């Protein structure tokens, strides 16, 4: 409720007169750091291509992952692409497809 040095804590925004720290609305908005924003930030919705991994809280935006069938790597900024269903002609599977990676193959 009390700002310190004109910044409010994570999960809160500052009031218009700079004297109150107001809680973000859980499941609707968030702030992750000590800020002087007059508004909390809008939570990202995992619409169609992506399913929700973790919900939005006041201090944390929601985290998405691609649905089963598609994958994206660890810190990969790339868009989400389809997993192969089988290895090419003359190779074997040594790893299954997840949200995290493609199927892994190897020769003979």
């Amino acid at each position: 409720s009390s700002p310190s040095e004109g910044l409010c804590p994570p999960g809160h925004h500052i009031s218009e007169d700079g004297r109150d720290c107001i809680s973000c609305k859980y499941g609707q908005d968030y702030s992750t750091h000590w800020n002087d924003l007059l508004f909390c930030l809008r939570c990202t919705r995992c619409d169609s291509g992506e399913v929700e991994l973790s919900p939005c809280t006041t201090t944390r935006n929601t985290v998405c992952q691609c649905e089963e069938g598609t994958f994206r790597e660890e810190d990969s900024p790339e868009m989400c692409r389809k997993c192969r269903t089988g290895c090419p002609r003359g190779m074997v599977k040594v790893g299954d497809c997840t949200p995290w990676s493609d199927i892994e193959c190897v020769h003979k």
Epitope: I14, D17, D36, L38
Partner: antibody
Framework: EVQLVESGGGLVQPGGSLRLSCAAS????????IHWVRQAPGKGLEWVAV????????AYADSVKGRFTISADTSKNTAYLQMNSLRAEDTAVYYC?????????????WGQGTLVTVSS | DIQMTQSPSSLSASVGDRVTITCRAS??????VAWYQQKPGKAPKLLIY???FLYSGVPSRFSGSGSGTDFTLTISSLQPEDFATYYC?????????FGQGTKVEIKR
């Protein structure tokens, strides 16, 4: 959803007057404020003014000081830029944006903008 | 008051490329810097505020860094939606001032 809609643009003579309005929806102007920013055709962004309607506090670009006046009507959730003594060089798209922060001039939810042309 | 100088004026790049836009203040502005994106016929959008913090709905391939004089916007892997003009802003003092823009076009 937040939305800002500029109106009032048009072609006027040098020395003339124009009043821009910015209708806000989805948030209280009284709990934040509004910025005006302009982009001359083919150029970059030049901030012109801000208003904090809670305490009536205003600030202006040096280019614009004494000639433009920013005001607000919290009952109508609208801000206005009264532009007087207009010069050719004021020609630009004028955007309004919401005051996102208490001290910093961070701007979000910019409107589509309104074109102001000053010519004889 | 304070000039912000962006560099480069323009660059061409491919989808996937790492892109680095730099802004230089003529004075110490600490971390009081934002970055904006603008596409033709459209209004600017906030990407980043206070030098390194992402605005709502901005993907994680966007990164801001810097303090004092030298600031940086990074796009780790360029996407089709990322070809636009980018503008730095300082808000350390009134009036806030903008760089002249970096146009990011597509290489073919």
């Amino acid at each position: 959803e937040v939305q800002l809609v500029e109106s009032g643009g048009g072609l006027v003579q040098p020395g003339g007057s124009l009043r821009l309005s910015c209708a806000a929806s989805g948030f209280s102007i009284g709990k934040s404020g509004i910025h005006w920013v302009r982009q001359a055709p083919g150029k970059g962004l030049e901030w012109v003014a801000v208003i904090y309607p809670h305490d009536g506090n205003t600030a202006y670009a040096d280019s614009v000081k004494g000639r433009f006046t920013i005001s607000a009507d919290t009952s109508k959730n609208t801000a206005y830029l009264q532009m007087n003594s207009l010069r050719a060089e004021d020609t630009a798209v004028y955007y309004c944006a919401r005051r996102l922060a208490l001290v910093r001039m961070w701007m979000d939810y910019w409107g589509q903008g309104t074109l102001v042309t000053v010519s004889s | 008051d304070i000039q912000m100088t962006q560099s480069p004026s323009s660059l061409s790049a491919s989808v996937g490329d790492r892109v680095t836009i730099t802004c230089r203040a003529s004075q110490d502005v600490s971390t009081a810097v934002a970055w904006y994106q603008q596409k033709p016929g459209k209004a600017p959008k906030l990407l980043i505020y206070s030098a390194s913090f992402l605005y709502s709905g901005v993907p994680s391939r966007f990164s801001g860094s810097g303090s004092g004089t030298d600031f940086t916007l990074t796009i780790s892997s360029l996407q089709p939606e990322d070809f636009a003009t980018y503008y730095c802003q300082q808000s350390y003092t009134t009036p806030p001032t903008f760089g002249q823009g970096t146009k990011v076009e597509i290489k073919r």
